[PDB]
Amino acid sequence: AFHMTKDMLPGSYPRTPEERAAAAKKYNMRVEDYEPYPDDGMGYGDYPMLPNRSQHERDPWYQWDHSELRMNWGEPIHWDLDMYIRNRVDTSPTPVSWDVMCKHLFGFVAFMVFMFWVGHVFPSYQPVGPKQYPYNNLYLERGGDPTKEPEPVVHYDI
Amino acid sequence: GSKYKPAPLATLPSTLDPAEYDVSPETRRAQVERLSIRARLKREYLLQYNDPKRVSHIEDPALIRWTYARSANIYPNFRPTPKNSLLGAVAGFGPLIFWYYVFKTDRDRKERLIQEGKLDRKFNISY
Amino acid sequence: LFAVSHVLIPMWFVHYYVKYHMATKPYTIVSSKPRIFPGDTILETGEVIPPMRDFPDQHH
Amino acid sequence: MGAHLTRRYLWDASVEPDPEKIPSFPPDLGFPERKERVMVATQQEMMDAQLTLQQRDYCAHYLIRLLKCKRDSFPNFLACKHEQHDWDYCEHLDYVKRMKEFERERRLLQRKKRRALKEA
Amino acid sequence: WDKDVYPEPPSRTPAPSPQTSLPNPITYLTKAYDLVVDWPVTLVREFIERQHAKNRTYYYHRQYRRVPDITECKEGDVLCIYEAEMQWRRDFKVDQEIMNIIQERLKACQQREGENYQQNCAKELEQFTKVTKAYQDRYLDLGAYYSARKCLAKQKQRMLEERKAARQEA
Amino acid sequence: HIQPRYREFPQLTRSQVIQGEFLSSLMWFWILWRFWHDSDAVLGHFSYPDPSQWTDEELGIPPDD
Amino acid sequence: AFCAPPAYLTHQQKVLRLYKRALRHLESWCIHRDKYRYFACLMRARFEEHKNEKDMMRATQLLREAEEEFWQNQHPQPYIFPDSPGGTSFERYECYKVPEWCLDYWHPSEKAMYPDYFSKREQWKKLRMESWDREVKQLQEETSPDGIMTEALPPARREGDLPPLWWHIVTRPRERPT
Amino acid sequence: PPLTLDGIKDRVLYVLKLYDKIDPEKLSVNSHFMKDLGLDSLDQVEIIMAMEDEFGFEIPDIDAEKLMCPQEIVDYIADKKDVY
Amino acid sequence: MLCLGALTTLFTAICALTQNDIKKIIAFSTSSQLGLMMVTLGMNQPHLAFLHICTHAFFKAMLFMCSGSIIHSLADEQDIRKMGNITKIMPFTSSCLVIGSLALTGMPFLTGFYSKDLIIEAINTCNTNAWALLITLIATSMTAMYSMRIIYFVTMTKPRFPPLISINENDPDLMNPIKRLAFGSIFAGFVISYNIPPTSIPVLTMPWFLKTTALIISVLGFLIALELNNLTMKLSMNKANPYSSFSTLLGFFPSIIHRITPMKSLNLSLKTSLTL
Amino acid sequence: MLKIILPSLMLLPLTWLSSPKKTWTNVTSYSFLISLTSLTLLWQTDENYKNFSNMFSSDPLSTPLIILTAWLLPLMLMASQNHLKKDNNVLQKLYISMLISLQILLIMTFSATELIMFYILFEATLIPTLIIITRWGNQTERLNAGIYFLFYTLIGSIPLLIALILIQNHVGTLNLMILSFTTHTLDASWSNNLLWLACMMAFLIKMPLYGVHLWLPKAHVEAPIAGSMILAAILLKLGSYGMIRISIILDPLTKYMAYPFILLSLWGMIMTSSICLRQTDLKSLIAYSSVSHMALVIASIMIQTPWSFMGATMLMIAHGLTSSLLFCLANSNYERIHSRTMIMARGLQMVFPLMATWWLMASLANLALPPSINLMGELFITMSLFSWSNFTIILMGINIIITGMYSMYMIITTQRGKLTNHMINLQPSHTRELTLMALHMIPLILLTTSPKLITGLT
């Protein structure tokens, strides 16, 4: 651990207000922006609860020290930066509201699926009777048993 | 007149964010300050990476505080509550018990059928 | 021309392989039949396939 | 996509025949005598011409001809044209054969309905 | 290759009956292949086989003769049973390449008879069940620790059935 | 090699125009040639029968009763 | 990308940066040109009026209702240029922008050819080490007298001194490596 | 062809000479759009946008709130596409 | 598969109508044509499905390299919005593009026509979902529409490309292959259809509306699209948003199913399966 | 088999007696040839397995491994010449000897007729491994990792000791040959239901099962590269080899006493595969990849169908070679980067063109690309698992999709993307690094040509 004191590494949930302001230094944040992850004992500890926004909408023009993570050097990394990376989940505002999206998409899906059902109920079939194959519907050639002759299926003219 | 409606995804854009438009003097003071923390950190990366005569690895300790927080500062901050042990048993034994009654029932259906003589097992000369 | 180089040299080899390994080994190059039609002769046996009947439908 | 669908789905029913079971009345519902269809090709001729089972129709015989003139006349793929018309025609003449059978079954079922009201 | 273990049907080919003035683009090419691809190769190959026939050598088959099986074998006598689990593990393979041949002989009979496979190729599929119903009846339930003692039991569990069912029919 | 042009219609080489008109004209020669020799795009060449003109004798429609 | 981000945004830069997104999102709707150039000088009108509102409150109430009018009247697929974010050719030729500190591990054979190239390269590396001291000192002697620090860095202010923290704005991998 | 500065220089000059508000016989590099050519800030948004469409790339917002000399535009464009 | 092939045909085609990226429109057309290919396999007509695969390869390959020519000749502009009047500036690719476009729209006596209308009338004659039959035909009109969208925006319009013009397609390596495939696109359907073995026993007997349906729907598809493109040139109704979006941002399957699944599948590993 | 072993022992005298400067080449060159003598065992022209002598035997299952165990010693000694080149000339000769003893012991364990010979040699391999991990381990936590590696194996080991002494009294000899040709059929009592667990549990522990696999992620993290190669390639497979030879007895119980493990493994396969999806330490991700691809194996050595066992033998040899390759290249990044973090070091192909080709082939071996023994293996275990219950494809079907995702993510965020701005400049690749890789993959290409050799006993 080259140059890392325990107090320069994370610690326990900041209980007293002086500890919440000490941690905010460790993490190079503003003391009024350090909002520890809720204390429900799932391990987060003192790690800052940074806004859940993906690196996708981090200004795409600024010279980010780490270009591809669109993260500067020192800025507190997000807990789930392994998911909000540009190559994965996005949380980038969308011109259409999310609900509107979910409803519309699935509506389409449902209407389609349904209409397809209306279809199977009412199919489209030309005015043509059934096709007629010779012999006994090709009983033997459809691989039928040579020994056992089939009930003759005959087809008459017109 | 549809109003954009940020969801945990598809969040509220910068514009259309009421907070941003109106802000108290204190707020500006914050922002004017947060830049300072960043500018400070920026001028602590930019004259150590642009330093001639350097071979050592710029460390990015903000990433080292992240990994330690995520794989070596977890169990020292574990307190067994409810919503954690109920949810810590449904996850380990829940499906593990689900599939057992999925595989037992199938394996038992199969065995019965084989025993009674129905399963065809045709052209199956391998297993 | 060099064209022949990597079209002819590879070919001889392949042929060497296909006519003296594959061909030789059993069921390595199998075909279908030759689609004989009524009235066409079978070279190997000498038989002449019997012709069809004289359907006179016409009316095209 | 004809009007047959309209007649069955929309509006009336029990008149337009069911696509399945088209041949549903006795082969002679008043048909005095009807010679069964005739198959020109021998079950073997087909098996030797390797005609796909589906293509073994009552036109299998004009097909074999086409295929003959397509193997022969090989370098020329544009010259077995009369043979294709023939096959196709044979295929139409049975396409209409099927059309006629369907219409006959339609009308016959109507007969039933007409006869039905004679009843009471 | 034995024409009888890997059979192969006689060939029937329609004779050439051209009905077009145009010249077949295949016949010309072959006439070349036969000269610029076959002759050159043909020459080399022969020269191979004469190099072989000078110091012609031979290799035999290693006939394994029979030996007491399990049912003849004492219980606990690891010597006899060892010699007899091998005699079976050996026939577990000889009885497996046989099934490899029926897997193969068939495959060919459905490439050689397309569009007729439904019918012409039923000499073998009748055999692929006459051989599969047997392989299923001596070697299938067994674990990966297949041993002659277990085939002896897989059988003998069922020899009851061909004796309980039979007696049952009474 | 050609020369960059600013706010002007790029000069065109003889070949660019001729090859372009060549490919298009052959497309039209082929469409016209086949249409004349084989006009079965419309009607195929087999006419649909009017299913509603089949004398009741034709279909086996017994005389009602 | 070059200049540093201001801390907070003014009223103006927010208005004047809508005039860009707006007009540029009006040229996706107006695919043609005469229609566009028309429908756009009509846009300026909208911004042209309500230019002299002195009532800030009002101004920030026209802006807040402009950017919602816009969000709901934007094009899903606008015209974003290539080499700009999101659109193509953005990071295309970055696979070929190697970072230039890699020519330092080249085998003496490789660097044997390309001879004058490394003769000028060694000059520039002498420039870089010859000023790090005067630079960092400058960066510091001119340090802020307050915690208010912006990422803006100072110019040279003396002859011979190289405008500071410059080794990576100059010596940047070329854009199109090709 | 690659963009030589003395060309890019003329190209940016040219387009402005086609903007009606900016006199065609005075626009002179080093003639600040706003304090010399006397153009509205609202205009400068457009003047830049024209350039972004003459040279086919986007001058980022923060770097373009300052393209006011009619020359800054000529070195910034050139510095962007690496024209020495 | 008849059902899902049918849904993809229209779903992809409708998305293609509003896409403004030239390569994207062609790609959606790749999916829509394969949707038709899926439909024929679903109607158990395997041989003709294979016939479309071969004919599909010639023309789609042409259109994409045609746009390759336009994109490379222009300063890497991949958007129909800034590309215009390629017909006069670059007749060689424009000629190749329209040859390909008409083949895509099943112009009579071109490679698409020999295989595509066989598939269309197959549908019109088989017993099938009514919803599938209707969508496949309007999908065919949509193929004409987006085909119309490409040539109107890319070729027949006043130029909107960046002002300096440097276009060269003279390089043999551009023309030759484009020229060679163009010959294939013009003659391949003729050659492949006659040569292949008789198969499928098609039904050439149809009421004339169904026999000519593919031809007419393709014709009015362009007709209606040409009408809509004209409406654009006028000075009016800058913005038009009639569900245009659902069409323009891929039916919203990308916006929603790509942000939820990768988010709920990774959150569960880190937060629940790994750490808990 | 004392040429694969005695000449090996003599390596120890050579590492010690040889010159400090020439110690490395004498040892690596000689064990390459030691591997060549190992290849002679592959000459089996008959089914009768090869019983070299009373205590030493080699059957199809052991032979494919003995050769791998002999093969990696050369490679291990080539991958640790860098780190361990900063030592005092007597710390090296200890590390080299430690590596030498591992394959001496492992060669014998894989080539042992008496099951308790397996146990004594089986549990001895921990001594050399714990020293390699604890003494040379870089991180502060290796003392902890060593404890985890010793206790999980040891607590499992003493039950097996009691069980094997137990069967010796019940049957009268622990000789694998006889035990096979003798009637040992457990009687489904409650006690036997315990015997079975006693014998399998020790093997199931070092073959990380979902329940007890925490030892392997911790151990490989701080272990030096040579220790991580040994643990993944040969050490974990010791557990599989044991399960194949021990379930010859306990024949009836595993029919119904396996369900617990089978379900533990298949669900485990999914969760272990998934957490690979977001793990920041590359060595961490390869280790969980190793747990999941080994969870498939315990689910084939328990279904017990000929193909399973054959799939298992294929996958174990194949995954062994692939994992090392991944652990070896992970180390090359670690030594120049100086950090295990996956997020740093992005874009390497831009600066290390070939290592990236090795990275790509290693990942394609990691996921199941088809002309690879890795796929043949999974395809077979998949088939049998399907036979056990058609539903198994769902769980063995979520693993395939996840396995593709993490394997490519290792390539996408380590060997592609924009280059890291200026980490300590990354010196070019040594020829040793590249060969150490080539030596791993060239055998993977050659074995895939003729899969029959690693096909198992079934």
Ligand SMILES: CCCCCCCCCCCCCCCCCC(=O)OC[C@H](COP(=O)(O)OCCN)OC(=O)CCCCCCCCCCCCCCCCC
């Ligand atoms: C991604 C795959 C999507 C498609 C999956 C389903 C494909 C078709 C197969 C399912 C339907 C088969 C119907 C024919 C009978 C098959 C044999 C059979 O009898 O199945 C029995 C099985 C028993 O399961 P169970 O619900 O426990 O019933 C206990 C009854 N005393 O009852 C079942 O059939 C179970 C059906 C499968 C359920 C598991 C696979 C889908 C769900 C995955 C969940 C993963 C997480 C597991 C749970 C986590 C939370 C606890």
Ligand SMILES: CCCCCCCCCCCCCCCCCC(=O)OC[C@H](COP(=O)(O)OCCN)OC(=O)CCCCCCCCCCCCCCCCC
């Ligand atoms: C037909 C009628 C019914 C219609 C609906 C039926 C359901 C259809 C969809 C079923 C599930 C399909 C797969 C879901 C994931 C799709 C792939 C994906 O989302 O990756 C895209 C993601 C972001 O990329 P994108 O949004 O395209 O933007 C790129 C340009 N900005 O790029 C990423 O890298 C995201 C992260 C990828 C790595 C982790 C992904 C999760 C891996 C394990 C779960 C895999 C998915 C779930 C299991 C399989 C389900 C089928």
Ligand SMILES: CCCCCCCCCCCCCCCCCC(=O)OC[C@H](COP(=O)(O)OCCN)OC(=O)CCCCCCCCCCCCCCCCC
């Ligand atoms: C042994 C147990 C495990 C030990 C692991 C470590 C061992 C290291 C030290 C020993 C290394 C050498 C010994 C192992 C390799 C053995 C190679 C071999 O056995 O080749 C056999 C092959 C003859 O083929 P054969 O299978 O006899 O014929 C089949 C007839 N039905 O003869 C040949 O054809 C040789 C051909 C050489 C070049 C072949 C290249 C072919 C590549 C094909 C796949 C390409 C794509 C692979 C994708 C992989 C993706 C990861």
